[model samples]
Target: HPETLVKVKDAEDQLGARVGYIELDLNSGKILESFRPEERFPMMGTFKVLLCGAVLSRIDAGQEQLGRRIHYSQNDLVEYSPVTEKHLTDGMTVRELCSAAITMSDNTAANLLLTTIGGPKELTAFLHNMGDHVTRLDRWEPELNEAIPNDERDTTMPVAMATTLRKLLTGELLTLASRQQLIDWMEADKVAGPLLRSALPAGWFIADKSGAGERGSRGIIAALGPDGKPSRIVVIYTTGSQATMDERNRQIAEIGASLIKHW
Candidate 1:
């Protein structure tokens, strides 16, 4: 038999949620493990990774600047905006908005950046420029998180996401400074959040972007570090489950355990 299989399907069944994931070796581009890898799942907050990446591309082309300041009003605030909500008057720089959108999953910050980039269609164009044909962004935050069953809007397959994310992180698609900027933002997020901590044993380390919302939408696009394994990209997502969000996350956590074992 092929070495023992990942129990992701079991996790999905146990949690009553559909699970989709892909694990790729960052250095060699090998697929380590996968379950429904090409299956579509709502991008949810995970799109923030690509969103900021698009902004960085603009920065690379000299069309945008990190220091550029963006001002918004109290009326622009969205739910779950921990950072931008605080800067209603003084405003925040492009870099600050990217940091808040990625680290805190701040909705208002994301919407502001989305507008800065000329809306969702432009960000999707950025993904296409990176040769990502399977991912699409159709709406702004809050609404972008609808995650309706069978809805094609604001969704991406795990394989498509992993490949595109890999390019953004380590490929020639982004300039060195812009690549480092995205890496810094994601790592900063790990300093405070735990996407799969519930599934990991002590000493295991990962840096990731997490997404959660209605229809039990949840996801994590992460980089597992040298905690005894070659660093790799791990993407996990679940949605359309009748189960509670925490219960759905339990499925992702179980998938996390399986990936650890595969390594």
Candidate 2:
């Protein structure tokens, strides 16, 4: 209810879409500001982070091994999987798959890794186990990215995701080494540029994942600020806009600019 920041509202209106955003100080759990924090936006490629988180949980449970290589072939190829498509001959290890899924946003890599975690439903169960009741993963890629308005399937609330992300990367649900690995994977993301990273100051620490859904929908999440000590958490998702993708992307950038102004 305290989410009526004029700056965010202006960005929402500018994009001509529904915008849901929340930024919290992970150290204090204090919500700096937000809007539509409970509204769902399709998860798109962003769920890869959680997918790997679930897999890493298995690895921590001693039921899985990151060092064990899982092989796939040309049959596993999926659209938008630049990293995995190149490695059809020699399969990647679980660690490499996590990295590729996070950094490269490899669709094939995520699907491959998803199977290892037992599929979308299992990932949603992982979210529930992590105390996140709002985020759900009901489908696999491309289709999971349907992102059609109000037709929830694989979607997440901004606050729900922000809290879940904090719990995964900062909470004790993971071994210290594995937690750091996940953050490091996000830091190494190759998909940033025209989104959250674009608006943040040069050289500021930003380990984030960006996702694109149908109809110009986009979600760009989490930056630990400078020195990598992991400061605030920012979650931004927008959808149902007929605006050009460039305009939608710029709207998110502008929202980032506003939040940083208060920083």
Candidate 3:
């Protein structure tokens, strides 16, 4: 068993986050550490990982085109920030929407992609059919797209997330050709939000997606080390934060930084 233990004290004071941990040894298919692996929490934007993966699959299957433009429905206008509120272009491609979702965390871009790529029914079915039961995707709804919790608003635990991420790194979740494309998509991400980017060492190529919500936040960092080796996939989530966003974020930054040092 490839197992490791970490002390939470280093991160507790500064980050003050409710902690969840998962460690994966990809080469040997080992779960070295886990705390609350099955406990569910709001996935928030982190679910974008699945959404993006599904889109890549769609692109591979020729069932969806990244370049196809579907008008932004009125509901898309409700929750979308100005960044994603731009007019739907007749030329807007599925590729562009995928980029927006990954790089910018654009909600409109995500919902548009979800609807165009056959919605959560297919996503749920696809993953379940593949024997990955830790993650789930619900049907996309206008309200969920905006901010309110509705159908298609899914959630997962840290352990399951790490498992899924590890599989992606190992190319177990996708066909060989599509797996390469998935890696490209992950590398193309622009968000560079706190959790991973703020922690891991420079020159470490981390392909990850973050999730956030009221009183909650989550992220998964999959690093590509030298020689194309896959490094540990770190999954972190925090909920019921009592402190202000800055305080919480600062704690996350500090703790994440500390976590990296020990790694």
Candidate 4:
């Protein structure tokens, strides 16, 4: 049996959230550490990683084109997005849209990608086909403005996420070039907004995607550790954390420290 990295009760006590965590050893195929990894949590923006994977999969099948231009209008506007200032007025390629979706975690950008590839339903089917039983897309963003709880939105378990990322990185789900493309987008992200990436040890790196859920009700980070090789994998999701974002951010940094120590 795999050891628990952080006990569920201790995680709940410290962060005041329903926490789901996992750390996998890529080289050994062993789940070296975890906490409630099978438990589902709101995917929040973490869904974008899978979303991009689906898009790339379709492209590899010759059903989509990366160079195809996608135009967004005023109706697609999503307020308070990090990259809205740069993308709101342009015609972007599938490549740029995927970049913004993963790197910026832009809600509108993700919607565009979802729209181009056939919306949430398509993503759901795509995930199911990929053997992901616990991850599903509930709806596109901006439509989520009506104030729904995180659990009621897109959701996944740490184990499912870890599985999905492993397939993508190991070339089981996507071709090598397509896999590298997605990893580059994740690596190029200038914002280290997610918990795991921001908390990672010096000299260590990750290709990650992050999401901010309702009132910080969900905080997620799913990543492939350094070199995109079989080095390590980490997935951490927090929902309904009582701590303020700042406090939880600090807590995750400490959690990352502990993870590195044990690994």
Candidate 5:
């Protein structure tokens, strides 16, 4: 498999990346390959996955309905434009909001869902009970914000996140319909940096979420390949890249596409 290593190593340089990857088989708890999978970085918008899961669980448990609507006040607004600043006169439906939050990475929609879903702490505790301990959800809070420092932020690890998605995809976490709907939301996600999505075959069905800011960007994916078989999850985070956003995402998608093709 030296040739496989060579191809990956060459792609690393071509992409000019410092990368980490995790491959998880959902049917069996197998880790085929892992590079720094335990290293934690703030989840970016990937927090939405757990949040989304919590919602689905509630729906399955008969706690809520999919058509639930949440009103967005001018106060819960964040810096994102397409979601927050958009002139949506009508309040968003539960499904539409969740879709926008995951697919578009809408911060405002995420916050609204968190509040509707019982805030970040409730969602964080839910994930903790699920045995995924690496992600800490404290984004909208003021007190916890001081702990990570300005140069640092809350984080999620590839192993935990990959495992989380693997369970979700395999219907280990939510109802089968819920799992499929969550995948539907992730498939619409807009953040495509970090090279995890770039390496897939054309017409690949990927359910992924990515988070980004001025500092850096990261992504995690759950996918079905062209053959319609479930593929492993790959999570990546990176900093210190000079590439433009479009270029970085193009490369990232290419990398994700390639990984699926080769693996």
Candidate 6:
């Protein structure tokens, strides 16, 4: 554990920023390693997973269906959306919105989904019931664009995020099919960092979601070991990095390498 601690500290030093991370052995339900994992930080698009979960919770309650089509006005469109970029004027289903939010990191779809699910307040309630205590969605994307600052934006702790991921994958909070859909979307995520995928050995299947904004990058990568069982869970959130996104991601990739080497 000391060695792991030093490696994580080294990465933090190199990046000149605070790093909140945790690794878990899912089979034993043990926390394998952690550094500042309990501290909350602005999670950017990482919170989109919970947004999707909130929407799914509604679906699970028989309050809504995935096939239900949703249309968005101009106000729903936010910056950094493939949905807007593609000029897809046709309405989208809840499932499709969830997919674009996660897989493509589409902001317009996320906002539309958030509004559809009754905004951030409802999502916070859903997270609380799901056992996440510290995370909160404070504002919409438009509010963030006004330079509200990261500390005042949506936030989450590494440990809280890891717990939520575990619950989702183990079917503690949702149906088996719902859990599978989440995993499938995460695995198909086109916007994740290469760190976890690069550090792991072959045959370790990864299902992950990654997010970044003006602050920095953060992600949760859950792996199914070669044995076809949940093995490793890596949740890393970095902010206030003096380095650019490219360097920050490289440092994170290096941190992932160090973690796998020590694990």
Among these predictions, the greatest TM-score belongs to 2
Question: Best to worst by TM-score, what's the order?
Answer: 2, 1, 6, 4, 5, 3
| Candidate 5 structure quality by residue, lDDT tens digits, 1-263 | 23333444554565575445566766785886666677765566667777888988888999888897666667667667466557356677778777877877777777778887788778878888888776778766222223332233456677888887777678566888998898878776556534455555566666677765443343455655556556556666544445667655665565555556566
For residue 72, give model 2's deviation from the true position in Å: 1.5
Q: Is candidate 2 or candidate 3 better by lDDT?
A: 2
TM-score of candidate 1 against the unseen true structure: 0.92
Instruction: Write the residue-wise lDDT of candidate 1 on 96-215 in tens digits.
Output: 999999988899999999999999999998888779999999998899899889898999999999988888888998999899888878876742243466566667656688898688
In model 2, the runs with Cα more than 4 Å from the true position are: 1-4
Assess each prediction's global lDDT (C-alpha) against the native.
0.83, 0.84, 0.61, 0.72, 0.65, 0.75
Better of 1 and 3 by TM-score: 1
lDDT of 4 by residue, 9-100 (tens): 46677876677787776666567677888876777777888889899998999999999888777777776466654765667888878887
Q: How well does each candidate superpose onto the true structure, as a TM-score?
A: 0.92, 0.95, 0.81, 0.88, 0.82, 0.91
Question: Per-residue CA lDDT of candidate 6, range 99-170, in tens?
Answer: 998889888888888989888898888888877778788788745422233464577888888877777677
Candidate 3 Cα errors over 4 Å, as ranges: 1-17, 73-75, 81-83, 139-153, 224-229
> In model 5, which runs have C-alpha deviations exceeding 4 angstroms?
1-18, 84-88, 141-153, 190-199, 240-243
RMSD of each: 2.3, 1.8, 3.8, 2.7, 3.6, 2.3
Q: Which order, best to worst by lDDT?
A: 2, 1, 6, 4, 5, 3
Q: What is the lDDT of residue 238 in candidate 6?
A: 78
Segments of candidate 1 deviating more than 4 angstroms:
1-6, 190-194, 198-205, 227-230
Deviation in Å, model 1, residue 85 alpha carbon: 1.0
Clashing pairs in 1: none
Backbone clashes in candidate 6 total: 0
Q: Which scores greater on lDDT, model 2 or model 5?
A: 2
